[PDB]
Symmetry: C3
Amino acid sequence: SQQQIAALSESLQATQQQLQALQQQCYELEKTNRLLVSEVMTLQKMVKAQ
Amino acid sequence: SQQQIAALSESLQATQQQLQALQQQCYELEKTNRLLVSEVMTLQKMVKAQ
Amino acid sequence: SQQQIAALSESLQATQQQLQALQQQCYELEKTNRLLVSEVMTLQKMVKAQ
């Protein structure tokens, strides 16, 4: 029926929006991981200087 | 009709559950990264202050 | 209608495929995280012994 189709269509829409937000979280994680690489390397350099 | 819609509804319920697990996984990585950033910045300060 | 049903089925399958992609991305982000955790632990020891 139309009511069943709309309910599934809305539930799928809610899921698809949650997945786009997760995709963004992943990108942000990739970013933080890179910044940490950099700060860890900085720390490594400084420990090595003494 | 209904039984196809039911099938898809049930399939979506599975995808939505996997999606919750992934959200939780990313939350745990975000937490870890907060801890690492805090640590690394403190340790940098410590080494510099020697 | 059957066309609405087929359209939802395709949409669901697309969402599921993307979710799988994200899952595998998250597996790589976890591995990187693990590396960083190890490296930071190592530095933490050293700095404490400085």
